[PDB]
Design an enzyme around this catalytic site. Sequence first.
Site, PDB file in Angstrom:
ATOM      1  CG  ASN A  36      -7.671  36.486  71.214  1.00 52.90           C
ATOM      2  OD1 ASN A  36      -7.986  36.542  72.665  1.00 52.90           O
ATOM      3  ND2 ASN A  36      -7.892  38.002  70.273  1.00 52.90           N
ATOM      4  CG  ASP A 106      -9.084  32.489  66.221  1.00 49.93           C
ATOM      5  OD1 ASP A 106      -9.443  33.272  65.396  1.00 49.93           O
ATOM      6  OD2 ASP A 106      -8.580  32.693  67.620  1.00 49.93           O
ATOM      7  CD1 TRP A 107      -5.969  34.490  67.004  1.00 50.06           C
ATOM      8  CD2 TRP A 107      -3.808  34.302  65.665  1.00 50.06           C
ATOM      9  NE1 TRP A 107      -5.093  35.530  66.884  1.00 50.06           N
ATOM     10  CE2 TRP A 107      -3.917  35.530  65.596  1.00 50.06           C
ATOM     11  CE3 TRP A 107      -2.443  33.204  65.337  1.00 50.06           C
ATOM     12  CZ2 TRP A 107      -3.102  35.998  65.037  1.00 50.06           C
ATOM     13  CZ3 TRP A 107      -2.064  34.234  64.274  1.00 50.06           C
ATOM     14  CH2 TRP A 107      -2.372  35.524  64.179  1.00 50.06           C
ATOM     15  CD  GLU A 130     -15.933  30.977  60.866  1.00 51.43           C
ATOM     16  OE1 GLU A 130     -15.098  32.316  61.675  1.00 51.43           O
ATOM     17  OE2 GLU A 130     -16.253  31.296  60.116  1.00 51.43           O
ATOM     18  CG  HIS A 270     -14.409  33.479  65.450  1.00 49.14           C
ATOM     19  ND1 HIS A 270     -14.340  32.907  63.937  1.00 49.14           N
ATOM     20  CD2 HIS A 270     -14.130  33.524  66.048  1.00 49.14           C
ATOM     21  CE1 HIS A 270     -12.896  32.535  64.292  1.00 49.14           C
ATOM     22  NE2 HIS A 270     -12.623  32.746  65.785  1.00 49.14           N
TER      23      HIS A 270
HETATM   24 CL   LIG Z   1      -7.785  37.431  67.256  1.00 50.45          CL
END
Ligand SMILES: [Cl-]
EC number: 3.8.1.5
Length: 294
Positions: A36, A106-107, A130, A270
Amino acid sequence: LGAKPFGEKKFIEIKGRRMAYIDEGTGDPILFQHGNPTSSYLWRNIMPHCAGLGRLIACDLIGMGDSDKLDPSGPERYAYAEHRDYLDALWEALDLGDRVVLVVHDWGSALGFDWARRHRERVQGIAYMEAIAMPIEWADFPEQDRDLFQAFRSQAGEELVLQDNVFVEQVLPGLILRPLSEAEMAAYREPFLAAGEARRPTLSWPRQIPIAGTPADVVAIARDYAGWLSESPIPKLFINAEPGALTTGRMRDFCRTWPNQTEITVAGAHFIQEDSPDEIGAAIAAFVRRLRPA
Ligand SMILES: [Cl-]
Ligand SMILES: [Ca+2]
Ligand SMILES: [Ca+2]
Ligand SMILES: [Ca+2]
């Protein structure tokens, strides 16, 4: 760098919806999964480094990138479980085989780690950065963005994200060290140009992060793959970031206990793919060459 996307977008019907993805080359897959509020576009300057090393794939999560939105959308849409159902089906439809190398962020890492735990026999290697490697506490969340994410996870979230597109316009640039070009931001906001539900995925995602025990279902899923990854002998490549953001402190200490793991550090917060794409691509390519010797 470069603002041009990697390959051409391909589409396939999944659960009555249309999902977009990049699929270039032949051989065992090297699967790149964004989080995201990005899309396959995130890996545009990294995927080239793996040219000829395998089938390069990057899928756009449902409701993101060029993938269809899920109408009717609302507060209950785009939760982790729903994203998993669509991604599982897409990955099945792509006929990946049993020697897959995952590259997650991330996701995409929560989804990728979970998928790997469930299809461990088909996973040849896991490169991550990350990532959401385990359930965390608020004290583990990046200090500078802590209050904003607590707000996302409150009634103020709808205005911040659905009305003002804060995750795309504020968080994204805020966690990239170098200045993005006009075209790069255009590519990132394209799927979210319209105010309202079109932006729901970017709000539902932060509300799904396993923090302080909530949401319970995602916390359990993360606890599950965290335990598994800490014991799995599957080769791993941990791309640490400096200063980094999510994978720092306790989570980083945890990731560093994972077996059969190679680690390198690159500059970035990130969305490190925008700051050190060549370092990252070179590391992933070397990882794959070792996993796939001639
Ligand atoms: Cl998020
Ligand atoms: Ca084979
Ligand atoms: Ca606070
Ligand atoms: Ca910035």
